[PDB]
């Protein structure tokens, strides 16, 4: 980090440490999109 005390949460373990299970980005208008890993259940979950 840059400054010890950034995004610190009240809980004793900052959940940012844990493995990230997704990603967000901006849409055609400027709104956050919520792309979750579970959306792979349509591509990698194939019979192939």
């Amino acid at each position: 980090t840059r400054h010890a005390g950034d995004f610190s949460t009240v809980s004793e373990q900052d959940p940012r440490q844990f493995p990230p299970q997704g990603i967000f980005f901006y849409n055609k208008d400027g709104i956050l999109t919520q792309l979750t890993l579970r959306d792979a259940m349509g591509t990698i979950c194939h019979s192939s």
Partner: protein
């Protein structure tokens, strides 16, 4: 005016201009047939 709602709805949606029902409605969203409008509001079998 007031309306009850769930508590686990995100703040992503309320930062930009949106509709209070949460289900995005409209009439400009289809223009070839007629039996397809009532479901743009009253059908949740489909997606938003």
């Amino acid at each position: 005016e007031f309306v009850a709602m769930p508590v686990s709805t995100d703040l992503q949606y309320f930062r930009t201009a949106c509709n209070p029902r949460g289900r995005a409605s409209g009439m400009l969203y289809m223009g070839d047939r007629d039996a397809d409008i009532e479901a743009i509001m009253f059908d949740h079998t489909q997606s938003d």
